[PDB]
Amino acid sequence: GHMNSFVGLRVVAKWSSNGYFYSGKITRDVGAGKYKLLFDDGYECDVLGKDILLCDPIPLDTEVTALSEDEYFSAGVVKGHRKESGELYYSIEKEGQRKWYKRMAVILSLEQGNRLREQYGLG
Amino acid sequence: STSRHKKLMFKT
Numbered sequence: 373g374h375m376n377s378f379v380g381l382r383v384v385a386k387w388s389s390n391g392y393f394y395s396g397k398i399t400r401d402v403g404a405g406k407y408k409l410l411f412d413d414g415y416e417c418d419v420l421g422k423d424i425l426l427c428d429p430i431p432l433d434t435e436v437t438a439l440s441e442d443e444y445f446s447a448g449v450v451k452g453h454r455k456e457s458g459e460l461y462y463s464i465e466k467e468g469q470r471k472w473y474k475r476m477a478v479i480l481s482l483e484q485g486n487r488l489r490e491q492y493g494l495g
Numbered sequence: 496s497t498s499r500h501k502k503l504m505f506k507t
Contacts, residue, residue, distance in 0.1 A: 391502055413505050443498045479503065 378407055378426070378494065385409040386423040386485060392437070393425065393485035395476045405495060412476035422495030425488045429453070430462055430478055434487075438464045439477040450478070 375381060378398040386393050396411040405421040430436060432450045439445050448466025455461070460475045480488070489495075497504050 387502055389502070392500075394503070413503065413507075415502075415505070437500060439499070439503065445498065445500050445503075479500070 377401070381426055383409070383494075384425040384428045384430075384480060384485070384488075385411070385419045386482065387411070387415075388417045388419060388423075390482075392482050393480035393488075395479075398424070407494065420495065422489055422493045424494045425485065425492035426494060427492040428488055429460070430475075430480070431488075435481070435484055436462075436464060437479045437481060438466050438471070438473045439479065440473075447481070 379400055382397050384393050384395050394411050396409045398407045399410045400408040402408050402418045406418045407424060408416060409419045410416050430450050435449050437447045446466055448464040450462050451465045451470055452463030454472060462473050462478045463470050464473050464478060
């Protein structure tokens with residue numbers, strides 16, 4: 373059979389303070405189309421169904437921001453995928469360099485995330 | 496000072 377009622381699925385969502393799109397899990401259906409989202413950094417907010425993306429392994433050739441363990445932040449384009457023991461990775465071509473970043477280290481600018489709401493949106 | 500974007504300048 374199919375997966376359960378959103379609550380438990382790994383997805384990507386818009387942080388509600390008119391921000392960008394960050395990876396997380398649905399924790400609960402808040403109501404009326406809002407679902408509570410635990411972002412992978414440990415944060416939680418309510419997000420409307422349109423603003424949550426559940427068929428979103430970050431598409432290659434899409435533009436994204438990338439973050440390093442030494443705290444650096446810049447933007448580039450997905451051009452590969454990796455799996456490591458139980459987690460997911462993305463090769464980002466950033467400043468002309470194909471560099472491996474984490475699921476949660478690859479963050480979607482709001483205008484990128486819009487192009488995904490249409491196809492991947494819960495709403 | 497810091498080196499990170501909008502919200503992800505979290506405690507770690």
